Amino acid sequence: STGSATTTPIDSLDDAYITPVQIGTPAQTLNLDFDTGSSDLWVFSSETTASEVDGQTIYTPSKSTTAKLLSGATWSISYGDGSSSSGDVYTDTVSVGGLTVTGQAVESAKKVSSSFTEDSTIDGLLGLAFSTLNTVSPTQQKTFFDNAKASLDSPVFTADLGYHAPGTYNFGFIDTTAYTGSITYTAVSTKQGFWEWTSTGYAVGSGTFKSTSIDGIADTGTTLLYLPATVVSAYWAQVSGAKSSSSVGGYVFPCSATLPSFTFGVGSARIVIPGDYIDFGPISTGSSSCFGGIQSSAGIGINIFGDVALKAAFVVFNGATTPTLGFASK
Structural domains of the chain, with CATH = 5-174 (2.40.70.10), 175-330 (2.40.70.10)
Count of alpha carbons within 13 angstroms of residue 287, beta-carbon side: 13
Query: How many CB atoms lie under 10 A from the CB of residue 299?
Result: 10
Q: Structure resolution in Å? A: 1.3
Between β-strands 28-35 and 84-96, what pairing exists: parallel, antiparallel or unpaired?
Answer: unpaired
**In this structure, are residues 202 and 211 in contact, taking their beta carbons and an 8 Å threshold?**
no
Q: Assess whether the previous peptide bond of 260 is cis (omega < 30° from 0).
A: no
Q: How far apart are CA 161 and CA 157, in angstroms?
A: 13
> After which residues, if any, is the chain broken (C to N > 2.5 Å)?
none
**In this structure, are residues 195 and 189 in contact, taking their beta carbons and an 8 Å threshold?**
no
Between β-strands 68-78 and 17-23, what pairing exists: parallel, antiparallel or unpaired?
Answer: unpaired
Q: Is-catalytic flag, 35?
A: yes
Q: Which residues contact 237 (CB under 8 A, 6 or more apart)?
A: none
Residues facing residue 160 across a β-bridge: 168
3-state secondary structure 168-226: EEEECCCCCCCCCCCCEEEECECCCCCCEEEEEEEEECCCCCEEEEEEEEECCCCCCEE
User: Which is catalytic among the residues 35, 88, 92, 123?
Assistant: 35
Q: How far apart are CA 157 and CA 312, in angstroms?
A: 17
User: Which is catalytic among the residues 108, 199, 296, 297?
Assistant: 199
Whether the CA torsion 241, 244, 246, 250 is positive or negative: it is: positive
Q: Which residues contact 206 (CB under 8 A, 6 or more apart)?
A: 260
Question: Among 174, 198, 42, 191, which Cα is nearest to 130's?
Answer: 191
3-state secondary structure the chain: CCEEEEEEECCCCCCCEEEEEEECCCCEEEEEEEECCCCCEEECECCCCHHHCCCCCCECHHHCCCCEEEEEEEEEEECCCCCEEEEEEEEEEEEECCEEEEEEEEEEEEEECHHHHCCCCCCEEEECCCHHHCCCECCCCCCHHHHHHHHCCCCEEEEECCCCCCEEEEECCCCCCCCCCCCEEEECECCCCCCEEEEEEEEECCCCCEEEEEEEEECCCCCCEEECHHHHHHHHCCCCCCEEECCCCEEEEECCCCCCCEEEEECCEEEEECHHHHEEEECCCCCCEEEECEEECCCCCCEEECHHHHCCCEEEEECCCCCEEEEECC
Between β-strands 324-328 and 184-187, what pairing exists: parallel, antiparallel or unpaired?
Answer: antiparallel
Report CA-CA distances (Å) from 229 to 126, 205, 234: 31, 18, 9
Torsion-angle region of residue 311: left (phi > 0), alpha (psi -120 to 50) or beta? alpha
Elucidated via: X-ray
Q: How far apart are CA 94 and CA 24, in angstroms?
A: 7
Q: How far apart are CA 86 and CA 68, in angstroms?
A: 18
Instruction: Give how far the C-alpha of residue 142 lies from the chain's centroid of Cα atoms, to the nearest Å.
Output: 18
Q: How far apart are CA 41 and CA 103, in angstroms?
A: 13
Radius of gyration of the chain (CA): 20
